[PDB]
Design a protein around this ligand. Structure first.
Ligand code: CLA
Ligand code: CLA
Ligand code: CLA
Ligand code: CLA
Ligand code: CLA
Ligand code: CLA
Ligand code: CLA
Ligand code: CLA
Ligand SMILES: CC1=C(/C=C/C(C)=C/C=C/C(C)=C/C=C/C=C(C)/C=C/C=C(C)/C=C/C2=C(C)CCCC2(C)C)C(C)(C)CCC1
Ligand SMILES: CC1=C(/C=C/C(C)=C/C=C/C(C)=C/C=C/C=C(C)/C=C/C=C(C)/C=C/C2=C(C)CCCC2(C)C)C(C)(C)CCC1
Ligand code: SF4
Ligand code: SF4
Lengths: 64, 40, 141, 80, 106, 163
């Protein structure tokens, strides 16, 4: 396994993101060398209406 | 009836009951005890 | 495509009485656009500028003053009638340019021949502040 | 004469390409994503600045940005 | 030409009163922003956007117009009533020029 | 007295304003008959007006040169010169009510968010829960300092920032 576990909650660390210092469920993780593999899903929508986004390994950290 | 009570639990219906309470309370407190300004 | 199709400037046009949304003095002086397609039967379609017109069985040709007027029609034909239009750009000098299916495949489908352009290898944000480039142009490039 | 830059976060949705009326954007292969696709902006001379491309990108923050700049006849959408 | 009617199309119950936004596909999901609230009261009576069927749009329209009549008739009856019990009509009738009307005592 | 203001009892313009406002009703009362309802309505308004003026004078209010009562806000002068009921005491009568509304809404928000679908609980309220909290908030200042001294009032850098 390369990254966090399925169904595990993680905290985001992108300064650009609407979900920054916020928590979301890990939907999936790809192990094929992609730059932004970690797929995360949040309950709260962003300004557009999207509730998912692919984040990186360094950009996510353990909850709270 | 379960759905009727749920409709009554919506936001505007509950707000209506709140408004009649706060408004009727203030009015009747001005119907009796007319013209308060200084509190004794 | 296999090869760029050269323009046939003498093909039948649709049956359209005319309107006021046509071409202006800019077309003869600067440039104008023309679109071609091939229909299997006689149908009716909405023009971008004006009202309705009747296509003709076989090749059809229009002349427009803007690229958006042409691509607006492709989206209508590809969706409603499921056709494959192709449009060019004509200058005042007579030069002709083949624009939209430049690779033969529409842009929403990949093809091996294409080469990337204006591709930054970084995340949005994560770029220098304007003070670093204060006296020349560009913070994004 | 507008500027269009696409960033590393593209995932090959193609929704930017479908939305642009003026055919500024096209898809190019790439090894960074699952879909093995990436956008491109070869012909920005025909760009107009509608920002429908930015509206369609589903990322957290956009993989596509239109940085407005100097104007022109094609950019101002002048039939005349 | 003839009469044509479809019997018992819709059941009457308060089930959808509890579920606001049922008429629209987008709103039936539920609110995650406060914009859902404004779109609710706005798209409520846009029957053409709810469904493509022209028949259902006609049923909704013909029945909503009955509502405006009932809304008008209690308004109209209110003026007659408020003119009967809280007014000076009998006095104005005997001296119209000098007396002024009134029907909204406070 | 203070600030060059006379009490409302000793003022002349204050009584002038009373004689004026009653004269308007007496002129208006001449039109109607004694036993009619318009007469009873105006006599009551006359009775209320006579009561409004004497009660404001009895309460040690301060009337200016214009003849209208003025209020004092500093608790020092209010307590020294016996004018506390005007501003100083109602300040605490409000804040008790205002914090009541915050302590109640804050608790309904926290508790509904501990369950599934909290969005539905806002548009479709849980009235049994809302009434429960609304009758449990009589002692909200105790719970606040309890929650402050404990540290479970404020969140700690788990909030979104922008840069
Ligand atoms: C576009 C702007 C917008 C809109 C439309 C809303 C809309 C709403 N917000 Mg909101 N908000 C906004 C901007 C907005 N907000 C902004 C900018 C902020 C700052 C971040 C907030 C912060 C915020 C908070 C913190 C809260 C809301 C809440 C609410 C909801 C209030 C429902 C309500 O009042 O209960 C109905 C009305 C009442 C007055 C409740 C009274 C209940 C009493 C106790 C019942 C007693 C009466 C009894 C039952 C009847 C007896 C009658 C008898 C005498 C006949 C509503 C959905 C509240 C919520 O989640 O809903 C609960 C809430 O707590 N908002
Ligand atoms: C002329 C006024 C009028 C009329 C005729 C209608 C008619 C309609 N509206 Mg509309 N509406 C109006 C004004 C009106 N609206 C206004 C001003 C707003 C605010 C923007 C709305 C917002 C609105 C929404 C959000 C929705 C509707 C819906 C509907 C449909 C619902 C019919 C229904 O359930 O039976 C109503 C049955 C009755 C018997 C009427 C009387 C019911 C009373 C009020 C009892 C309930 C009151 C309760 C006990 C508390 C208060 C008591 C007391 C103080 C009155 C119908 C087409 C709904 C729909 O499905 O449309 C597609 C819907 O979702 N409307
Ligand atoms: C009959 C016509 C009618 C009218 C005039 C309204 C009006 C309103 N609806 Mg609405 N609604 C209607 C029909 C109608 N609705 C129907 C038929 C349905 C389907 C069941 C709904 C379902 C519905 C939902 C689900 C919600 C509303 C909400 C609202 C309010 C918007 C929020 C706001 O600005 O307050 C913003 C308020 C705050 C920021 C803070 C709270 C303070 C409020 C103002 C106190 C309470 C006001 C009270 C309700 C006023 C009395 C009623 C008034 C119309 C006479 C607004 C008062 C929203 C709401 O929360 O209502 C309060 C809401 O979530 N409506
Ligand atoms: C907060 C709500 C509230 C409270 C505490 C009271 C309290 C009172 N009302 Mg009252 N009332 C209210 C709301 C309220 N009212 C509303 C909303 C209406 C509808 C108009 C009325 C209509 C009403 C009438 C018609 C009468 C009272 C009367 C009374 C008094 C004796 C019962 C009592 C002081 C009675 C009274 O005058 O007391 C002797 C009386 O005859 N009330
Ligand atoms: C900043 C806003 C503000 C403030 C501070 C006041 C303050 C006051 N107004 Mg005013 N008023 C306002 C806005 C305001 N008003 C507006 C906007 C209008 C127009 C809609 C009015 C119209 C108005 C009238 C017509 C009257 C008042 C009255 C009063 C007094 C009544 C006290 C009371 O209810 O008994 C005390 C009540 C309680 C202690 C019970 C509440 C506590 C609960 C039960 C707990 C008080 C000095 C009345 C008065 O006596 O004037 C001197 C009066 O007759 N006001
Ligand atoms: C002589 C026959 C007759 C009469 C008098 C009417 C009268 C009316 N029609 Mg109408 N209509 C008729 C035949 C008739 N229609 C036929 C044959 C058809 C089908 C071809 C229609 C189809 C039709 C539609 C689709 C609509 C109307 C509407 C209306 C109303 C318009 C509201 C208005 O202008 O305010 C005038 C209002 C009044 C004078 C108030 C009186 C209201 C009472 C209840 C009506 C009494 C007449 C009634 C039709 C008699 C039969 C009812 C009986 C079987 C129980 C009005 C009451 C509109 C409607 O329903 O709005 C609510 C509407 O949208 N009509
Ligand atoms: C367009 C419609 C319309 C409008 C705007 C009004 C407007 C008004 N009416 Mg009117 N009215 C109307 C139609 C209308 N009416 C019709 C159709 C009828 C009879 C069929 C009446 C019968 C009526 C009466 C009998 C009275 C009014 C009163 C009033 C005034 C509101 C005060 C009130 O009732 O307290 C609002 C009260 C509430 C919201 C509480 C709800 C009512 C409860 C259930 C009754 C409690 C009484 C208790 C058992 C004792 C106001 C000027 C009153 C008035 O002006 O008196 C000076 C009054 O006494 N109206
Ligand atoms: C910013 C708020 C504020 C302001 C501007 C004033 C202003 C004033 N206060 Mg005051 N006061 C305040 C808040 C405030 N107070 C509060 C919150 C309290 C506690 C309840 C007091 C308690 C208080 C007392 C007990 C007395 C004053 C007095 C005075 C006056 C003399 C100067 C003074 O304070 O001593 C100089 C202060 C140096 C720091 C002056 C008008 C005195 C007075 O009556 O003046 C004649 C006096 O005896 N104040
Ligand atoms: C009348 C009468 C009476 C009494 C009653 C009562 C009940 C009392 C009162 C009550 C109360 C309890 C009152 C209150 C008052 C209040 C006030 C007086 C208020 C005012 C306000 C203010 C104070 C404001 C201020 C301000 C400003 C100016 C600006 C800034 C902000 C602020 C807001 C702060 C009796 C019994 C003898 C009987 C007979 C008659
Ligand atoms: C007394 C008085 C006075 C004075 C005053 C002063 C000057 C004060 C100051 C003060 C200050 C200087 C302070 C500040 C600070 C603030 C704060 C900090 C606040 C608090 C708040 C909080 C924290 C919150 C609250 C809440 C909410 C929001 C909800 C939940 C719960 C609670 C309720 C708690 C005067 C003469 C005027 C008037 C009369 C009386
Ligand atoms: S819209 Fe954005 S995320 Fe989607 S394919 Fe285009 S560049 Fe990538
Ligand atoms: S602004 Fe419009 S024309 Fe320009 S790149 Fe975006 S979608 Fe294409």
């Amino acid at each position: 396994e390369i990254g966090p576990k399925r169904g595990s909650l993680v905290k985001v660390l992108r300064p650009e993101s609407y979900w920054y210092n916020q928590v979301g469920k890990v939907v999936s993780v790809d192990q094929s060398g992609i730059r932004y593999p970690v797929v995360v899903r949040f309950e709260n929508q962003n300004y557009a209406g999207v509730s998912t986004n692919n984040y990186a390994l360094d950009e996510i950290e353990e909850v709270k | 009836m379960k759905d009727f009570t749920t409709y009554l639990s919506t936001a505007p219906v509950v707000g209506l009951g709140w408004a009649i309470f706060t408004s009727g309370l203030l009015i009747e407190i001005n119907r009796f005890f007319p013209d308060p300004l200084v509190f004794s | 495509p296999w090869k760029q199709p050269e323009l046939d400037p003498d093909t039948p046009s649709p049956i359209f009485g005319g309107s006021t949304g046509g071409l202006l003095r800019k077309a003869q002086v600067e440039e104008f656009y023309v679109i071609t397609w091939e229909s299997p039967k006689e149908q009716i379609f909405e023009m971008p500028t004006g009202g309705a017109a009747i296509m003709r069985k076989g090749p059809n040709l229009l002349k427009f003053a803007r690229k958006e007027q042409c691509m607006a029609l492709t989206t209508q034909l590809r969706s409603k009638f499921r056709q494959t239009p192709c449009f060019y750009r004509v200058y005042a000098d007579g030069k002709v340019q083949y624009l939209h299916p430049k690779d033969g495949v529409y842009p929403e489908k990949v093809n091996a021949g294409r080469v990337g352009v204006n591709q930054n290898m970084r995340s949005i944000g994560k770029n220098v502040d304007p003070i670093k480039v204060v006296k020349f142009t560009g913070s994004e490039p | 004469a507008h500027v269009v830059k696409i960033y590393d976060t593209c995932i090959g949705c193609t929704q930017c390409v479908r939305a642009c009326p003026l055919d500024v954007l096209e898809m190019v292969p790439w090894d960074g994503c699952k879909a093995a696709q990436m956008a491109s902006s070869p012909r920005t001379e025909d760009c107009v600045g509608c920002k429908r491309c930015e509206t369609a990108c589903p990322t957290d923050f956009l993989s596509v940005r239109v940085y407005l700049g100097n104007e022109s006849t094609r950019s101002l959408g002048l039939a005349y | 030409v003839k009469i044509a009617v479809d019997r018992n199309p819709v059941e009457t119950n308060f089930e959808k009163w509890a579920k606001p936004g049922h008429f629209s596909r987008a709103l039936a999901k539920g609110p995650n922003t406060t914009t859902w609230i404004w779109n609710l009261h706005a798209d409520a009576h846009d029957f053409d956007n709810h469904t493509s069927d022209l028949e259902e749009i006609s049923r909704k329209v013909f029945s909503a117009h009955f509502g405006q009549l009932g809304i008008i008739l209690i308004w109209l009856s209110g003026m007659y009533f408020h003119g009967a019990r809280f007014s000076n009509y009998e006095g104005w009738l005997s001296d119209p020029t000098h007396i002024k009307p009134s029907a909204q005592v406070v | 007295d203070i600030a060059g203001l006379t009490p409302c009892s000793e003022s002349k313009a204050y009584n002038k304003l009373e004689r004026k406002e009653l004269k308007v009703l007496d002129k208006r009362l001449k039109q109607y008959e004694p036993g009619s309802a318009p007469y009873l309505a105006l006599q009551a308004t006359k009775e209320r007006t006579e009561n409004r003026f004497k009660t404001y004078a009895k309460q040690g209010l301060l009337c200016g040169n214009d003849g209208l009562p003025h209020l004092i806000s500093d608790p020092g002068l209010a307590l020294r010169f016996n004018h506390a009921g005007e501003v100083f005491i109602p300040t605490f009568g409000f804040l008790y009510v205002a914090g009541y509304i915050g302590h109640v809404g804050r608790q309904y928000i926290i508790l509904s968010k501990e369950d599934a679908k909290p969005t539905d609980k806002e548009i479709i309220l849980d009235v049994p829960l809302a009434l429960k909290l609304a009758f449990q908030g009589w002692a909200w200042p105790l719970a606040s300092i309890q929650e402050l001294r404990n540290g479970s009032l404020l969140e700690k850098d788990e909030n979104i920032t922008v840069s």
